[PDB]
Amino acid sequence: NAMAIHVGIIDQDPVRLVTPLLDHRTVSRHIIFIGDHTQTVIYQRLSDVLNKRNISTDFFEIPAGSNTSAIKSAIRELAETLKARGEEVKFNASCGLRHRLLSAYEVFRSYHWPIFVVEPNSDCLCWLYPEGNNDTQVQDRITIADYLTIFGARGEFNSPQLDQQLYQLGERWASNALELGPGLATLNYLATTCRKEQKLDVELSDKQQGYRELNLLLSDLVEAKIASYENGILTFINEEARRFANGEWLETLVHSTVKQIQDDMPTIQDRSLNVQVYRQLGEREVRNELDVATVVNNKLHIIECKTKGMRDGDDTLYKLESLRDLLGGLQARAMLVSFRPLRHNDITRAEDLGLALIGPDELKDLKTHLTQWFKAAGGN
Numbered sequence: 001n002a003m004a005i006h007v008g009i010i011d012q013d014p015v016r017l018v019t020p021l022l023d024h025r026t027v028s029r030h031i032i033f034i035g036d037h038t039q040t041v042i043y044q045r046l047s048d049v050l051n052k053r054n055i056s057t058d059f060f061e062i063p064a065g066s067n068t069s070a071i072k073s074a075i076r077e078l079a080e081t082l083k084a085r086g087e088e089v090k091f092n093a094s095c096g097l098r099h100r101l102l103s104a105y106e107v108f109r110s111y112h113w114p115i116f117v118v119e120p121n122s123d124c125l126c127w128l129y130p131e132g133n134n135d136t137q138v139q140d141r142i143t144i145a146d147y148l149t150i151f152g153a154r155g156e157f158n159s160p161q162l163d164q165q166l167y168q169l170g171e172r173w174a175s176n177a178l179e180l181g182p183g184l185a186t187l188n189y190l191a192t193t194c195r196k197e198q199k200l201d202v203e204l205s206d207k208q209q210g211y212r213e214l215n216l217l218l219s220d221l222v223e224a225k226i227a228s229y230e231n232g233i234l235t236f237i238n239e240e241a242r243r244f245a246n247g248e249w250l251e252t253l254v255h256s257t258v259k260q261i262q263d264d265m266p267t268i269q270d271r272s273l274n275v276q277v278y279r280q281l282g283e284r285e286v287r288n289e290l291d292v293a294t295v296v297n298n299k300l301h302i303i304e305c306k307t308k309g310m311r312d313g314d315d316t317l318y319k320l321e322s323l324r325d326l327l328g329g330l331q332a333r334a335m336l337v338s339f340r341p342l343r344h345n346d347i348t349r350a351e352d353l354g355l356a357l358i359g360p361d362e363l364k365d366l367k368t369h370l371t372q373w374f375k376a377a378g379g380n
């Protein structure tokens with residue numbers, strides 16, 4: 001209980017030093033992170049997440065050079081103080097540069113303290129010493145919010161009859177996506193006119209009033225009781241209905257589908273819609289939005305939804321991959337869900353970058369393709 005502690009080596013992706021302490025089966029409620037002076041900030045972030053849970057933390061600084069007899073010396077001093085107290089040390093060897101990792105391993109192994117690693121792909125906690133201990137699957141407890149904090153960012157986060165109408169409307173549009181293509185573009189332009197004018201009504205031109213697919217859409221809005229359409233005037237009942245017709249329908253559907261899959265897939269441990277993400281650089285800031293964000297098997301999964309086509313020096317896929325890396329580190333995964341067809345360029349490019357895709361053809365199987373993507377996270 002009180003004497004049980006973890007020791008871990010900070011690196012640039014230290015999530016696997018936190019997830020063992022969040023697992024309800026772990027006795028230890030204290031960890032000492034070993035790092036160099038420039039990793040104080042990573043320490044502070046790690047501590048924000050763990051301290052929230054009343055898990056306590058300390059930072060023990062090794063010298064920053066590559067001299068390993070000096071590292072082993074610093075760590076043996078630490079070990080000897082821990083040994084003198086009767087601390088029941090467990091060494092989490094999941095993280096850290098290999099020179100520091102193996103120096104700490106030598107020291108801790110000589111004290112006969114248990115040593116384990118979370119294999120990042122399987123998420124299994126594996127006992128390196130003593131091999132007799134039983135490996136377990138790390139529980140899935142960390143949130144998106146915690147994930148962002150760890151990686152130096154901060155997120156800002158967010159009926160029943162309305163929700164179901166918005167859900168079923170999305171299903172219809174997703175499953176007839178190619179049929180509805182052009183019409184949803186015109187609806188997007190109409191919703192955008194309302195947005196720019198700050199109103200919920202818009203008069204259609206006579207040409208717009210004769211468009212076949214648009215009219216299919218207008219009458220869906222009407223049946224769903226989220227707009228009225230009378231004498232060429234389209235009125236949304238509210239801003240959320242206007243945003244929905246503007247194109248937020250697809251991310252709403254994806255969020256709603258993830259929530260359905262999660263009822264039977266406990267590895268999906270967190271989910272959110274339109275997370276605002278902030279990162280400070282001195283006085284400056286970079287702001288991003290995550291259309292649907294999840295954590296699954298302790299790995300951050302981001303889904304970008306597009307309802308318009310990709311340009312043409314397009315940045316969508318380079319940017320998505322870049323967010324993935326920077327917000328969830330090496331195990332993070334990302335998907336683009338696209339209402340419009342994807343050019344082969346962008347397909348080949350998504351493959352090159354390791355980004356998953358769901359296009360219009362597969363939108364009628366959204367729930368299955370999403371399940372498959374989430375199963376591939378492991379953890380079951």
Ligand SMILES: [Mg+2]
Pocket residue numbers: 096097098099
């Ligand atoms: Mg290394």
